[PDB]
Amino acid sequence: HHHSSGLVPRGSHMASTEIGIIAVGGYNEMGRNMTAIRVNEDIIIIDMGIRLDRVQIHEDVDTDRMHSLELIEMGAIPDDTIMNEVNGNVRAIVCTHGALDHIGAIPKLAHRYAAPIIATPYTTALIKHQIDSERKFGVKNNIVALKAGETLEITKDITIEFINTQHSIIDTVFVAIHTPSGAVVYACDFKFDRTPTLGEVPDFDRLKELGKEGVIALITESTNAGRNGKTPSELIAHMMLKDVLLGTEESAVGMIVTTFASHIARVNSIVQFAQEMGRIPVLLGRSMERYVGTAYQLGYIDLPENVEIYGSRRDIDNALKKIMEAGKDKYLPVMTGHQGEPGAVLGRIANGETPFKVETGDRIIFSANVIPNPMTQANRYALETKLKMKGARIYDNVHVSGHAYREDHWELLRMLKPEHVIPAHGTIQMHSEYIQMAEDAGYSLGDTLHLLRNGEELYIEED
Amino acid sequence: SSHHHHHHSSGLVPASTEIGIIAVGGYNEMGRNMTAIRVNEDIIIIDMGIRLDRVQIHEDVDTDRMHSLELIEMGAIPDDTIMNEVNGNVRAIVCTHGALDHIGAIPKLAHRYAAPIIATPYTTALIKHQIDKNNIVALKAGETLEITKDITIEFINTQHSIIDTVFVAIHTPSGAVVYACDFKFDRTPTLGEVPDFDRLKELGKEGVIALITESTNAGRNGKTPSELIAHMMLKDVLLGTEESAVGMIVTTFASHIARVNSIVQFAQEMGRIPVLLGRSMERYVGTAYQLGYIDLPENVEIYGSRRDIDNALKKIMEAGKDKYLPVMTGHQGEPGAVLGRIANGETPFKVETGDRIIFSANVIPNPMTQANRYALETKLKMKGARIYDNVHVSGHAYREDHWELLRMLKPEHVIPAHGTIQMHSEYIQMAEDAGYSLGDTLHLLRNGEELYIEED
Amino acid sequence: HHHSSGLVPRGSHMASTEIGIIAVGGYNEMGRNMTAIRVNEDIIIIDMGIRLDRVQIHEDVDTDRMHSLELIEMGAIPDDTIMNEVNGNVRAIVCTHGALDHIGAIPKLAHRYAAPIIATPYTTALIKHQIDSERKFGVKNNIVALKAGETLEITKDITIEFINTQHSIIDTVFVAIHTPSGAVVYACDFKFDRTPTLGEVPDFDRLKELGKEGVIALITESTNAGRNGKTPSELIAHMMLKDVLLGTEESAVGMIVTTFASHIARVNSIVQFAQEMGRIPVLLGRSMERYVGTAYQLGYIDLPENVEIYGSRRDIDNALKKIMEAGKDKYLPVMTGHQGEPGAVLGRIANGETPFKVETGDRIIFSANVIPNPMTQANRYALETKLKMKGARIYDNVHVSGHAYREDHWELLRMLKPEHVIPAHGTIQMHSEYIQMAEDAGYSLGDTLHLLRNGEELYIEED
Amino acid sequence: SSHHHHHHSSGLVPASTEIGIIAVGGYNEMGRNMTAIRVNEDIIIIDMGIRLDRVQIHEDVDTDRMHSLELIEMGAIPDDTIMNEVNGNVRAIVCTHGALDHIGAIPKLAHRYAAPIIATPYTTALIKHQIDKNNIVALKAGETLEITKDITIEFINTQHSIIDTVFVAIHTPSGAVVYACDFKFDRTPTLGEVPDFDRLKELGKEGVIALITESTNAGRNGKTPSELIAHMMLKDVLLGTEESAVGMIVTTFASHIARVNSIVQFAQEMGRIPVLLGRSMERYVGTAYQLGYIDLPENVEIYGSRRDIDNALKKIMEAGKDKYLPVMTGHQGEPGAVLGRIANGETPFKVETGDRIIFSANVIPNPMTQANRYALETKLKMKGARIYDNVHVSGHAYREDHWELLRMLKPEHVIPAHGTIQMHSEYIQMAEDAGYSLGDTLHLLRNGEELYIEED
RNA sequence: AAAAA
RNA sequence: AAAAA
RNA sequence: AAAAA
RNA sequence: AAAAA
């Protein structure tokens, strides 16, 4: 004899999709970021970064004579040889922004793929300017400019959407890969910033919509997931830098500012402050000219008429000779070398290889943090020791992070409601931080939350 | 056969003043600050603080049952028994502000001196409320008070993590002795005034014999971020949220009136009614309001007693946590404070997953307070709370702030105070950069030592 | 038409075994260790520890009135309710040693299982003495004494082997669970020590043999896997303590030594040193009497005739009154309270609640480390501050770790050659350290190397 | 009407000596140690060291092309130009041992003084080899040397990370000035003798005016572990292995002769032939052997030149790494050292997975050396090496060692040296526990300052 | 770099 | 959490 | 708390 | 990497 135990309504499945999340670089370390998203047999590569400290430990630096495999053995750059064991063909290369941890390895690995590079206008410009700077013949991927808010079809089954976000470089995007079974979202090198000083407010609405439409997997950075609270706004750094530059009873002293050439919002703030304190803003260093110049040409920043930009050593040295013999109090040199890079303008000033002589009382403002690696900490120590031994006053860490804190990740997780989460852009320790946060959010390790190592592929079969 | 020459000096003259800088407390540690400035035989005492951590290591606090000498043996409070060896008489007791590290020992030591207590209005109010006896004189920033035919005291406005904080300048016939401790340059305060740089420069040109100044954050690079920074960060944490109807608790220094001000303003700007909870909140904020230092919105609610507080939390819980912004005590996980009691479930307020707890304060770097803070945060986290930490800006001068202070006052002698010998070491390296020499024009004093400064 | 592509010789499989590695407690934190090894449908529980700091954060301590579930909610103790979702029956409970992070939760959870407790003689003694110390009625598991080197049959298919190892408590073992498909080895709270001061030299031969016989899975601690090199021998701590106690030109000063009551090798060394410096070794504190007394009765340590042991408050206070009024220079008090435990002898001396008064010059030797938790760091700070304020001279950290370092794990891995490795006894951060080491040894995460969280079961099907 | 009384003192007497303690270098930093002790108008210089990190921040080392003044501007070496303001004449230059932080600046500054260099035999040997000019006098531990009718210098044996290290006692008609820097109490040395506690106590009772002593590890709790501890740990690392035929490299201080001794002994006990590689290994160990301080087994091999070294490594590689124990330079990842060259693959020796690299040294806490060490270890690890770090014991006295030193010598005045102001702060807290008072009997000197001590 | 009731 | 010419 | 060739 | 009575 037999009783009924109830009934189960079974859902339909009009599209099965096989998703691959391939960790190539930047899952075991910082710098050489590369991820590959496989939809069935088509592959979208996301970012191709470089890791600088692996270049610095070798007294040979070179980095432009060495080709891909030697750099991979140093790594340095992502080991993409594993792509030969991935069951698909690369259809596109997305670069979510233009800093070296996302495009630094483009000129070394991108030319081997039969795919266009898709990026934002500013990013595309930086990639182009960089590709045209190796002159080894000679294949160049075409570059498609895709703006935040725009969508691009790659395949009958694959579309790529850019969503604007904030970061320490302008024009940074989340990328959503739409598949017949739903979306794969990539959100790395980002920060929620509700009061940006240059870009736009993050697209929380679209994030929520995506959440409701269906997100299969989220690949997101774990870099500062261990840091408590929310990332302070860029406005905070704006305010602090303002206070450091204007708030002084020793006004006619002579001040040098140094920061990331790629941090366009920061540089912008600095030149405005120069205009508010009666000094002539003069930008020094090749990379200043590259990044800030490019940002200006494409209309991302406005520059005052008296702004001066110098890229060549003799232009720079003669500009510093002009400043030195006119009164340091009349200029605000905005220059490269905050990490004590050998050869940068500030490092050359510190060695006295320059008409500019730092004298007691002079104020040097590092609008940047020291990167937690022994190499750059050494270069910074030597730089600072020299500058102080010549009597300079050091203003350090006038800066705000470009990365999401724990609660930023919390809210992102609540908005996108991803089915699977994969931490990226960090060490396994950082991923451990992220994992604990995500578990608090209801995710389970090995189930809906996944710890990948470089070279590993997560297979997801969506019904 | 051999010769040389020398001019001899004449014994002719073309009232001498002897200065003593007596370090009493707060030169070997944090908290129990007390300095004594002797002009020949008249003495001005500056500040009388308490050190809380030396009270915490003994589980039996009752800081009002113990008399002065036992507190000194714990210390806790400054050892002023050394004043029995100082060749002078105390003519005044100056308190540069009203926080416990400047007035905490007032009720235990001040009564032994036949001298008035001189302080700013707010400070005087807190001292009065605290006593529950020296005369108390209210002296405002910018005003001068004569103490003796030869001695006057000037208050100069400055900024700090408590309102109405002053530098004090002791004017003598030989020049000024300046005391600048527990201070911060802030050119964009959210409460009070910008410090008096003009007067500092004037003083410098008039002649400063000695500067007694804090070394607390002399080790920190750069300049102290403005209170405006903490204002902005707190705004971002409180308003910048897609988890809006969650229920938020803010905790901070009850004495940081500027901060509490910012918080209640934000409460009015996020459509929650601000409820201030805890006895000390009632004390400091209440007093600040009565004296017209802070303005409060009509809907502001304050509860100091245990049952008032618990019934307020029962009211809040059963009306919607999303409708209130409780501003409460317990940011250091103080046993008995409102937040610590909420965390222990001894309260109608129950923390549930998602609730946001904002510590508008840093954790005090002492093992005791780090323990209490750890236990508190662990409990709150285990009940599902989301912790926003360090939404805060320092109340103390950084290295370059001291650089500029030194270059404005141009003192003949400098003495670091308000810290450990390590903090003083930082200050010393900075001052050496400015041209001072240790043991000559720069002096590292320990508690109990008297520095003699003579006229050339 | 058809060609042959070669042949493949296929192996036989005369016994399939399903293995479960269940992480119950101590995989997300320190202290409350509990693991469960499932062979088909029979379960061997390994260790049942407590986490002390979770008790300390509550101002209520109690820990003996509270029953299991409240302790689990604090946790504190392992959440073994998950055992109701594990497909098997518990046949035995192994305790690899007698310290609280292995037997601290025995009296709270063991009585719910219909299984005997298997342990070494010393461990068994401590478990018995502890069980007879709750007097709540009243079920007591029988305890089987199994010595290092001995094997015990539990099932037609399951045998348990003890292998001697070293640790900060005497009589510690690796446990090997022999199954028809091979062995599961558990090696937690251990240290290679080639010159022990009490136990035996580790059984490297047997480890190698096991390796060759076939190890399915290794569960091993990750606690100090991050620490570089090899764990220093106990002999090092012996030497340092000797030097601290004898090497002094201020000989008749009065010295107090404090250490782990359970560290029998250490205490032994101390009383021998007392005999070598003409002082009477007097042991104070209830737990000293418990652990050292027990170790003496079972013949693990020899004690000199003049040794004195006191467990009660009045015996202790009058012993200190005797010492105080006879000359501190004539005694070596060996007492509890190295973590500044409220109520311990040293903590009571520090509060002046004792005939013993510490005076300037007096030397207090902490033969122990400070546990990296804010609670115990607070208690230690208060204790030390009081002792120094009474003029004592503090000798700290005269101690050597009880846990394997990175290279110790390296060699263990090379000896056992396990098919699968699972890190245990630590946070996810410690496990991350272990994971990197194991990857260097050839293991692969998610494949032969497994990261478990509390409540998770790894299923292994051995052919 | 009113009265009191006082006894007046007589102007009768019931040769005065003025002591100057001049801090020249090594009081604000590590490395460039130099002190000058003035007795009225005769001066004894003690030590002349170099500071390596100030040389490293400039990539252009050549420390022999630069003359004294440029090295002083880098400093690098002590600024002894201040000696032009000191009212006295240098009668002797004492070097308490032969490591670079005591003799590194000898070839740059010693030649300007009309005075002999006095040192222990080994120290004299290293100075002589280094010079490639003052007279050099060898003075042994336990011996005394007359310098002046009023001044004698006594050497007292002590222990340290280099052999033949001494305390120096300067005897004057008013008592002794004792210098105890770069030292360690070690009652179980593996080389040399136990320090002379008897003589220290004797000195104490005879009368010590001033003690100049290191503060380097005064912050570390307890007592310095004996060199025997490092011996034992090194034994455990080298012999205690189930990975026996792997190939092992040991690196340590070339000047730490006791350590190298232990290592070669262990090499003979593990059936490997000890090969010492590197120029400085050849210098220090060679010199120590010739003078009979260390004994070497018959099979010992030493190579100082580049091709000798490379061909030795080619020999080793092609005979079996398991048969050799290379003892080489480069523990701090010094560019050009043997280990750094092996790590860069510029060498017949190739590191392969499993190889054990033993650093019998700690990493020096400076960003430069931490960088070099990081790059080195990363390379070695990337070639599969297993790193055994910190197999080492400190060469400097801990807090309680200083406690007992102070209680033995009973000096009237104490001056910390050989460290930063932070290290001195640690020492100061310890000395205050011992009864000394800062600015009175306890003195914190900076480079360039002269402390005057008069007779009562 | 502060308390808390 | 970044380079630099 | 030290260099290295 | 541990308790304590």
Concatenate the DSSP letters of all residues of D201-224 into one string.
Answer: HHHHHH-EEEEEEE-TTTTS-S-P
Is B421 within 8 Å of D425 (Cβ atoms)? yes
Q: Tokens in use for A308?
A: 């001066």
What 3-state DSSP class applies to A346? helix
Which positions ≥6 away from A121 have C-beta within 8 Å? A145, A147, A171, A298
Q: What are phi and psi of D80, to 5 degrees?
A: -90, 5
Q: Tokens in use for A119?
A: 């990026």
- B242-247 CB contacts, 8 Å cutoff, 24+ apart: B242/A204, B242/A208, B242/A411, B242/A414, B242/A415, B243/A411, B243/A414, B243/B354, B243/B356, B244/B322, B245/B320, B245/B322, B246/B321, B246/B322, B246/B354, B246/B355, B246/B356, B247/B321, B247/B322, B247/B324, B247/B352, B247/B354, B247/B355, B247/B356
Is B397 within 8 Å of B184 (Cβ atoms)? yes
Alpha carbons C50 and C31: distance in angstroms, whole number: 5
Report the number of secondary-structure helices (H) and strands (E) in chain C.
14, 19
Please tell me whether the peptide bond between D176 and the residue prior to it is cis, using omega within 30 degrees of 0: no
Alpha carbons A358 and A350: distance in angstroms, whole number: 8
Radius of gyration of chain A from Cα atoms? 24
Mind giving me the DSSP string for D378-435? HHHHHTT-EEE------SS--HHHHHHHHHHH--SEEEEESS-HHHHHHHHHHHHHTT
- The H or E element spanning position D199 is helix D197-206
Cα angle value A99/A101/A107 (rounded, 5°): 85
Is C191 within 8 Å of C166 (Cβ atoms)? yes
Alpha carbons C119 and A28: distance in angstroms, whole number: 41
What 3-state DSSP class applies to B413? strand
Alpha carbons C282 and A458: distance in angstroms, whole number: 62
Please tell me whether the peptide bond between B76 and the residue prior to it is cis, using omega within 30 degrees of 0: yes
| End-to-end Cα, chain C, rounded Å | 37
Which positions ≥6 away from C380 have C-beta within 8 Å? B367, C339, C340, C370
**Among residues D251, D328, D339, which one has the least CA distance to residue D282?**
D328
Residue D398, CA distances (Å) to A454, D225, D365, D402, D430 in order: 46, 9, 17, 7, 11
Is D376 within 8 Å of D163 (Cβ atoms)? no
Alpha carbons B122 and B136: distance in angstroms, whole number: 12
Is A403 within 8 Å of A220 (Cβ atoms)? no
Partners of A288 in beta bridges = none
Which positions ≥6 away from B19 have C-beta within 8 Å? B37, B38, B39, B172, B174, B177, B209, B210, B452, B453, B454
Resolution for this PDB entry, in angstroms: 2.3
Tokens 């700070």, located at residue = C381
Distance A347 CA to F3 C1' (A): 13
Residue nearest to nucleotide F2 (CA to C1'): A371
- B69-72 CB contacts, 8 Å cutoff, 24+ apart: B71/B105, B71/B108
Is D363 within 8 Å of D374 (Cβ atoms)? no
Distance B326 CA to E5 C1' (A): 18
Question: Residue type for D83, please?
Answer: M
Partners of B438 in beta bridges = B442
- The H or E element spanning position C395 is strand C393-395
Alpha carbons D223 and D188: distance in angstroms, whole number: 13
Mind giving me the DSSP string for D88-155? SEEEEEEES--SHHHHTTHHHHGGGSSS-EEE-HHHHHHHHHHH----EEE--TT-EEEEETTEEEEE
CB count within 10 Å of CB C326 equals: 11
Q: How distant is the alpha carbon of residue D181 from its chain centre?
A: 8
Beta strands in C30-179 (DSSP E): 34-39, 42-46, 89-95, 117-119, 143-145, 151-153, 159-165, 172-179
Cα angle value A49/A51/A55 (rounded, 5°): 130
Report the number of secondary-structure helices (H) and strands (E) in chain D.
14, 19
Distance A369 CA to F3 C1' (A): 13
Q: Using the beta-carbon criterion (under 8 Å), do A411 and B241 form an inter-chain contact?
A: yes
What 3-state DSSP class applies to A294? helix
Alpha carbons D43 and D37: distance in angstroms, whole number: 6
**Among residues D29, D50, D51, D55, which one has the least CA distance to residue D335?**
D55
**Sheet with A308-310, side-by-side order of all strands:** A308-310, A280-284, A331-335, A255-259, A363-367, A393-395
Q: What are phi and psi of B447, to 5 degrees?
A: -50, 130
Q: Would an 8 Å CB–CB cutoff place A348 in contact with chain D?
A: no
C contact residues 162-221, partner D, Cβ 8 Å cutoff: 192, 194-195, 204, 208
Alpha carbons A60 and B384: distance in angstroms, whole number: 52
Helices B121-131 and B279-290, interaxial angle, to 10°?
Answer: 140
**Among residues C247, C431, B356, B397, which one has the least CA distance to residue D187?**
C247
Q: Which method, experimentally, gave rise to this model? A: X-ray
The full set of domain ranges for chain A reads 1-235+395-463, 236-394
> Which chains share 3+ C-beta pairs under 8 angstroms with D?
A, B, C
Contacts of D54 in chain A (CB under 8 A): 385
Distance A293 CA to F1 C1' (A): 25
Q: Using the beta-carbon criterion (under 8 Å), do D425 and B429 form an inter-chain contact?
A: no
Residue C262: CB less than 7 A from any atom in strand H: yes
- The H or E element spanning position C124 is helix C121-131
Mind giving me the DSSP string for D19-36? EEEEEEESSSSSS--EEE
Residue C455, CA distances (Å) to B442, C21, C75, C82, C86 in order: 63, 10, 13, 6, 10
Is A402 within 8 Å of A367 (Cβ atoms)? no
Which positions ≥6 away from C10 have C-beta within 8 Å? none
Partners of B213 in beta bridges = B180, B416
Q: Tokens in use for D132?
A: 């490639």
Q: Would an 8 Å CB–CB cutoff place C12 in contact with chain A?
A: no
Residue C245: CB less than 7 A from any atom in strand H: no
Residue A314, CA distances (Å) to A323, A330, A350 in order: 14, 21, 17
Is B226 within 8 Å of A398 (Cβ atoms)? no
Q: Would an 8 Å CB–CB cutoff place C63 in contact with chain A?
A: no
Residues counted in chain C: 463
Is D411 within 8 Å of B400 (Cβ atoms)? no
Alpha carbons A332 and A281: distance in angstroms, whole number: 5
Residue B130: CB less than 7 A from any atom in strand E: no
Residue B56: CB less than 7 A from any atom in strand E: yes
Please tell me whether the peptide bond between D76 and the residue prior to it is cis, using omega within 30 degrees of 0: yes
Nearest nt by C1' to A403 Cα? F1
Q: Tokens in use for B229?
A: 């920074």
Q: Tokens in use for A103?
A: 């495009």
Residue C344: CB less than 7 A from any atom in strand H: yes
Mind giving me the DSSP string for D150-187? TEEEEEEEEB-SSSSEEEEEEEETTEEEEEE-S-B--S
Q: Return the biggest CA–CA distance within chain C.
A: 106
Is A187 within 8 Å of A221 (Cβ atoms)? yes
Is B201 within 8 Å of B408 (Cβ atoms)? yes
Q: Which one of C251, C393, C406 would you mutate to disrupt binding with D, by most D Cβ within 10 Å of its Cβ? A: C393
Residue D400, CA distances (Å) to C200, C363, D217 in order: 35, 10, 10
Alpha carbons C288 and C333: distance in angstroms, whole number: 11
Alpha carbons A29 and B204: distance in angstroms, whole number: 54
Number of inter-chain CB pairs under 8 A, B vs C: 35
**Among residues C381, C412, C378, which one has the least CA distance to residue C174?**
C412
Alpha-helical segments (H) within B322-420: 338-343, 367-382, 399-409
Kind of pairing between the strands at B165-172 and B175-180: antiparallel
Alpha carbons D278 and D273: distance in angstroms, whole number: 16
CA torsion sign, C315 to C318 to C323 to C326? negative
Which positions ≥6 away from B115 have C-beta within 8 Å? B45, B90, B91, B92, B93, B134
Alpha carbons A93 and A241: distance in angstroms, whole number: 37
Q: Using the beta-carbon criterion (under 8 Å), do C57 and B374 form an inter-chain contact?
A: yes
**Sheet with C159-165, side-by-side order of all strands:** C151-153, C159-165, C172-179, C182-187, C215-221, C420-424
Q: Which one of A370, A379, A381, A386 would you mutate to disrupt binding with D, by most D Cβ within 10 Å of its Cβ? A: A381
CB count within 10 Å of CB B235 equals: 21
Alpha carbons A75 and A78: distance in angstroms, whole number: 6
Q: Tokens in use for C30?
A: 């320190």
Partners of C119 in beta bridges = C95, C145
Which positions ≥6 away from D342 have C-beta within 8 Å? D249, D313, D328, D349, D351
**Among residues D325, D337, D187, which one has the least CA distance to residue D263?**
D325
Rounded-to-10 torsion of CA B416, B418, B421, B423: -80
Report the chain A residue with the minimal C-alpha distance to residue C453: A445
